[PDB]
Write a protein that holds these residues in place. Structure first.
Motif, mmCIF file in Angstrom:
data_model
loop_
_atom_site.group_PDB
_atom_site.id
_atom_site.type_symbol
_atom_site.label_atom_id
_atom_site.label_comp_id
_atom_site.label_asym_id
_atom_site.label_seq_id
_atom_site.Cartn_x
_atom_site.Cartn_y
_atom_site.Cartn_z
ATOM 1 N N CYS A 24 0.807 -1.216 0.000
ATOM 2 C CA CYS A 24 0.000 0.000 0.000
ATOM 3 C C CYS A 24 0.842 1.269 0.000
ATOM 4 C CB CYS A 24 -0.932 0.049 1.196
ATOM 5 S SG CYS A 24 -1.792 1.627 1.225
ATOM 6 N N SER A 25 0.653 2.085 -1.034
ATOM 7 C CA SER A 25 1.504 3.252 -1.227
ATOM 8 C C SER A 25 1.033 4.442 -0.406
ATOM 9 C CB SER A 25 1.544 3.607 -2.713
ATOM 10 O OG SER A 25 0.278 3.342 -3.312
ATOM 11 N N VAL A 26 -0.274 4.540 -0.154
ATOM 12 C CA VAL A 26 -0.809 5.688 0.569
ATOM 13 C C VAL A 26 -0.676 5.530 2.079
ATOM 14 C CG1 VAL A 26 -3.179 4.905 0.812
ATOM 15 C CG2 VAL A 26 -2.699 7.322 0.537
ATOM 16 N N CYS A 27 -0.418 4.316 2.567
ATOM 17 C CA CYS A 27 -0.188 4.067 3.982
ATOM 18 C C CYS A 27 1.275 3.837 4.319
ATOM 19 C CB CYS A 27 -0.994 2.850 4.452
ATOM 20 S SG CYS A 27 -2.768 2.927 4.096
ATOM 21 N N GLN A 28 2.138 3.654 3.315
ATOM 22 C CA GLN A 28 3.540 3.273 3.519
ATOM 23 C C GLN A 28 3.638 1.976 4.326
ATOM 24 O OE1 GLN A 28 6.092 6.650 4.682
ATOM 25 N NE2 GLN A 28 4.453 8.092 4.138
ATOM 26 N N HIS A 31 -5.872 -5.765 3.406
ATOM 27 C CA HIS A 31 -5.845 -4.369 3.833
ATOM 28 C C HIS A 31 -6.312 -3.463 2.706
ATOM 29 C CE1 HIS A 31 -4.627 -0.418 5.013
ATOM 30 N NE2 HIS A 31 -3.533 -0.410 4.273
ATOM 31 N N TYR A 32 -7.596 -3.499 2.377
ATOM 32 C CA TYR A 32 -8.065 -2.632 1.304
ATOM 33 C C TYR A 32 -9.523 -2.269 1.522
ATOM 34 C CZ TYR A 32 -4.407 -1.754 -2.108
ATOM 35 O OH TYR A 32 -3.316 -1.242 -2.772
ATOM 36 N N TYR A 36 -8.971 1.906 7.926
ATOM 37 C CA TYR A 36 -7.723 2.660 7.964
ATOM 38 C C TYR A 36 -7.309 3.101 6.566
ATOM 39 C CZ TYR A 36 -2.987 3.974 9.274
ATOM 40 O OH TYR A 36 -1.811 4.655 9.484
ATOM 41 N N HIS A 37 -7.185 2.142 5.642
ATOM 42 C CA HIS A 37 -6.866 2.468 4.259
ATOM 43 C C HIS A 37 -7.799 3.528 3.688
ATOM 44 C CE1 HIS A 37 -5.348 1.679 0.156
ATOM 45 N NE2 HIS A 37 -6.604 1.890 -0.204
ATOM 46 N N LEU A 38 -9.068 3.528 4.091
ATOM 47 C CA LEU A 38 -10.005 4.461 3.479
ATOM 48 C C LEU A 38 -9.739 5.895 3.916
ATOM 49 C CD1 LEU A 38 -13.541 2.913 3.054
ATOM 50 C CD2 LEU A 38 -11.968 3.904 1.359
#
Ligand SMILES: [Zn+2]
Length: 212
Positions: A24-28, A31-32, A36-38
């Motif tokens: 995941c690039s936006v969380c470093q 899991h989607y 949290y990811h949202l």
């Protein structure tokens, strides 16, 4: 082929590699559907009508979904859509008419009201009404409010049959007239409500099975 296997932004590799065009690039965090990811997606975003393929006895997709100035071919578009490398893919949806407005910023990622509608992820959504325009400032307020989202949208779908109502989205706002992303809905639509925005989205985002 069930409808669940037909979402244009979540097609399996088997179905993808079979599609053949008719002519995941936006969380470093390494899991989607997690909440949290949202929020991290949200935080970072915030700062003939068809084309046909052949496969398993004709799959149709709306031409409006593609970028006209693109050098890629439709198979290349579909494969890029179906890759984790576009997690902040969003589009905008706007309908106005008869004093009613509904807008939404829709994520291309699905979720867990029908089950197909229940999986539409609206990152933002607004609906209001005014008798009579005076709606114009209200809507220009939503557009400014969503400006970071709107500059990152793939497509901005707008229905405004009234000429003064179409002018609401480009008359001195954050959208410029002659923005390629701004497109009609390629099908008739009902009253402006949130549920109708989801109907429209499901109608654009799932392949259709048609005769040749
Ligand atoms: Zn994430």
């Amino acid at each position: 082929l069930k409808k669940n296997d037909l979402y244009i932004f979540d097609l399996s590799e088997q179905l993808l590699n079979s599609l053949k065009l008719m002519s995941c690039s936006v969380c470093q965090m390494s899991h989607y559907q997690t909440d949290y990811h949202l929020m991290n997606v949200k935080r970072n975003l915030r700062g003939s009508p068809y084309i046909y393929f052949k496969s398993k006895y004709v799959l149709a997709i709306y031409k409006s979904l593609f970028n006209k100035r693109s050098l890629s071919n439709p198979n290349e578009a579909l494969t890029f859509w179906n890759s984790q490398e576009n997690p902040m893919a969003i589009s905008a949806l706007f309908m106005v008419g008869g004093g009613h407005f509904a807008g939404a910023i829709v994520s291309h990622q699905r979720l867990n009201e029908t089950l197909i509608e229940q999986a539409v992820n609206f990152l933002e959504h607004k609906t209001f009404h005014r008798y009579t325009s005076a709606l114009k400032t209200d809507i220009q307020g939503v557009l400014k409010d969503w400006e970071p989202y709107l500059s990152k949208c793939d497509n901005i779908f707008i229905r405004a049959r009234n000429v003064s109502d179409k002018k609401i989205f480009t008359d001195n706002t954050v959208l410029n007239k002659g923005d390629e992303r701004i497109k009609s809905f390629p099908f008739t639509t009902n009253r402006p409500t949130v549920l109708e925005l989801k109907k429209a989205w499901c109608e654009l985002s799932y392949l259709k099975i048609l005769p040749k």
